[PDB]
């Protein structure tokens, strides 16, 4: 779901840069998650058959960020 | 869902730059999530058959950001 | 859903720049989420058949941002 | 749904610049979400058949932004 | 789900740079998670058959980040 590219970056940052939390779900079939460094690049999926699928899902994500100065702070349930 | 590209960036930022939280869901079939660094680039999916699908989903996402100075603060349920 | 490109950026910002939260949902079939750095670029999907689909979804997203100075603040349910 | 491009930007901003929250939903079939850095660019979808689809969805999005100075503030349900 | 590339980076950052927590789920079948350093690159999946699938999942993710100076702070359940 999340796609991020920075092919030419000059960056100056006094701070905690990449704070990454609570990503998600991937239910995949013959998927191609592809990354690399007459020309032919080829990622190929053929002719499949799927008959019957049933899924039931309950997803609960919790990310809490409490900063500065905190006192008797309650988070969550 | 989320697509972000910065191919030529000169950036100065005194702060916590990329704070990334609570991304989502990917239910995919023969999907191509593609990234790379006579020419032919090729990502190919063929001729499939799917008969019957049933899905039931409950998704609850929670991201809370409490900053500065906080006192007896309650979050969530 | 969210598409953001900055191919040539000169940016100065004293602040927390990219605060990204609560993205969404992707239910896809043979999808092409494509990013790269006689010419032919080619992303191809062929001739498929889908018979019967049934989906029931309940999505609840919660993002709360409480800043400055806060006291006995209640958020959520 | 959300498309944002800034190909040549000179920007000065003392503030938290991109605060992005509560994006949405993508239910797609053979979709092409395309981004890159005799010429031929080609993204192609062929001749498919879909017989019967039924979907029932309930989406509830909640984004709350409480700033400055707050006291006994209640948000949500 | 999470894809991040930085092919040419010059970065200066006095801070804890990559703080990565609470990633997710991958339920995959014949999937290709591909990374490398007349030309032909080829990742290939053939013509399979799947009859009947049933899955029921409950996922609860918890990431909490409490910083600065904290006193009697309660997190979680």
Residue numbers in the entry:
A (entry chain B), B (entry chain C), C (entry chain D), D (entry chain E), E (entry chain A): 1 to 37, 66 to 105
Sentences from the paper on this structure:
Cryo-EM 3D reconstruction of AL55 fibrils resulted in a map at overall resolution of 4.0 Å, in which the cross-β structure was clearly resolved. Consistent with the 2D analyses, the AL55 density map showed a fibril core whose consecutive β-strand rungs are related by helical symmetry, with a rise of 4.9 Å, a twist of approximately –1.6°, and two low-order outer regions. For each LC subunit deposited along the fibril axis, the inner structured core is divided into two segments: the central part of the density displays a “snail-shell” trace that is surrounded by a second, “C-shaped”, extended polypeptide stretch. Several bulky side-chains visible in the map, together with the Cys22–Cys91 disulfide bridge, supported chain tracing and modeling for 77 residues of AL55 Vl. As a result, the first N-terminal 37 residues map into the internal snail-shell region, while the outer C-shaped stretch hosts residues 66–105. As previously reported for other amyloid fibril structures, the β1–β5 modeled strands do not lay in a planar arrangement within the fibril; rather, the snail-shell region adopts a β-helix-like structure. On the contrary, the C-shaped region (β6–β9) lays essentially in a plane; given that it is covalently bound to the snail-shell region through the Cys22–Cys91 disulfide bond, this segment in subunit i is located at the i+1 level. Two salt bridges stabilize the fibril core: expectedly, Lys82–Glu84 is also present the native folded state, while the Lys16–Asp95 salt bridge links residues that are 40 Å apart in the folded AL55 Vl domain.
The disease is associated with the presence of a plasma cell clone, and is caused by extracellular deposition of misfolding-prone monoclonal immunoglobulin light chains (LC), transported to target organs through blood. LC subunits (ca. 215 residues) consist of two β-sandwich domains, each hosting a disulfide bridge: the highly variable N-terminal domain (Vl, ca. 105 residues), a short joining region (Jl), and the C-terminal constant domain (Cl). We show that the ex vivo fibrils are composed of an asymmetric protofilament hosting 77 residues from the LC Vl domain, coupled to two low-order regions that comprise about one-third of the Vl domain and portions of the Cl domain.
